[PDB]
């Protein structure tokens, strides 16, 4: 039960950390008559305008608090009808809300703590080129990962992994048509490598800069390049438990067998061990020791979690009022 219960935290953190679509709200969810729907339908709006591919289906995950308010919003309405009455008998708020095709409670979504960063600015103009591979010393071709990009900042102090930042003046683009959007481009900090450099999971790839060849400028998802004096705006202010939504193909779980059944291990008895619900498989092994008369038991499960499309991952942040 515990090994199957670690998989869930790794998919819940990996999504809340790398989500690059950030929906902030000035006031707590459910403080207004429909605002529970307008906060979910807001994710549909950025998902549709950002041009992303939903063909395999989308999903939305409420934390238990904001799921009660979505259900409590809907009970204030007159209790006639199927949707209000159902909410009343069981907290349930329909399976599909505002286009998503799923909605759920996921008790394990992490809390996104306050960021103490202030007055942080970029230093120097920084282009980012899309590349498939790059040369390395000894002249060897080496693949390059399209997601992450490193940024030099004035001072990195109070900003940590999974902090949501948006630069001042940058905007999203509809990826196919390259039209400008009203939302400021949001970036989640994957990692901090120094008191200066920071790694942000989307590559901005500005539209305006001239250093990009026509092949590269085709991938531009941001309207303008990072300038020198631009101020980094920290999105997460007050502490609130996040809400996460993705397209179903964005996150992936990879696994490999542990070949302890091989003849090479003759001292221990090992058997296949199946974890209860997730559907991964592990192994089970035990071995004795004559000196201490104390036997050892071990259960091993080897896998990994990968967010393939950090731009398709998104995170809601209700009640974010300074």
């Amino acid at each position: 039960r515990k090994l199957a219960n670690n998989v869930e935290l790794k998919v819940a953190n990996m999504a809340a950390e790398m989500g690059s679509l950030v929906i902030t709200s000035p006031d707590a969810i459910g403080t207004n008559t429909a605002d529970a729907w307008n906060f979910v339908a807001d994710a549909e709006e950025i998902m549709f305008s950002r041009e992303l591919n939903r063909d395999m289906g989308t999903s939305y995950f409420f934390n238990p608090q904001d799921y009660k308010k979505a259900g409590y919003d809907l009970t204030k309405r007159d209790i006639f009808g199927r949707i209000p009455e159902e909410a009343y008998r069981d907290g349930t708020i329909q399976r599909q809300v505002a286009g998503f095709d799923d909605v759920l409670r996921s008790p394990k979504l992490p809390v996104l703590t306050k960021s103490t960063a202030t007055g942080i600015t970029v230093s120097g103009a920084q282009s980012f080129k899309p590349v498939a591979w790059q040369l390395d010393n000894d002249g060897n071709k080496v693949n390059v990962d399209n997601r992450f990009a490193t940024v030099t900042l004035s001072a990195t102090t109070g900003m940590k992994r999974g902090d949501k930042i948006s630069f001042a003046g940058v905007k999203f683009l509809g990826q196919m048509a390259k039209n400008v959007l009203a939302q400021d481009a949001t970036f989640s900090v994957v990692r901090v490598v120094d008191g200066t450099h920071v790694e942000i999971t989307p590559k901005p790839v500005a539209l305006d800069d001239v250093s990009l060849s026509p092949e590269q400028r085709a991938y531009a998802n941001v309207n303008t390049s990072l300038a020198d004096a631009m101020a980094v705006n920290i999105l997460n202010v007050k502490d609130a438990r996040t809400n996460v939504f993705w397209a179903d193909d964005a996150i992936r779980i990879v696994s490999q067998p542990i070949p302890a059944n091989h003849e090479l291990f003759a001292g221990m008895k090992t058997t296949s061990f199946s974890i209860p619900d997730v559907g991964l498989n592990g192994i089970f092994a035990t071995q004795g020791d004559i000196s201490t008369l104390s036997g050892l038991c071990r259960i091993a499960l080897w896998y990994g979690v990968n967010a393939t499309r950090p731009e398709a991952i998104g995170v809601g942040l209700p009640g974010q009022t300074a």
Partner: protein
């Protein structure tokens, strides 16, 4: 210490990521027709059209 052998960099060509889904609502509404080509050349690529009388 462990097995030291030939490394591989493998890339699965088929899988893709399939990032973009387009929608084009207003191209089905607009009418489409081909004016005659021979007369369209010596024209400025302009063709006048009558308006219903009153």
């Amino acid at each position: 210490m462990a097995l030291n052998e030939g490394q591989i960099v493998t890339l699965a060509v088929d899988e893709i990521i399939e990032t973009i889904s387009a929608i084009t609502p207003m191209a089905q509404k607009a009418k489409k027709y081909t004016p005659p080509a021979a007369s369209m050349q010596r024209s400025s690529n302009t063709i006048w059209m009558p308006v219903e009388q009153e």
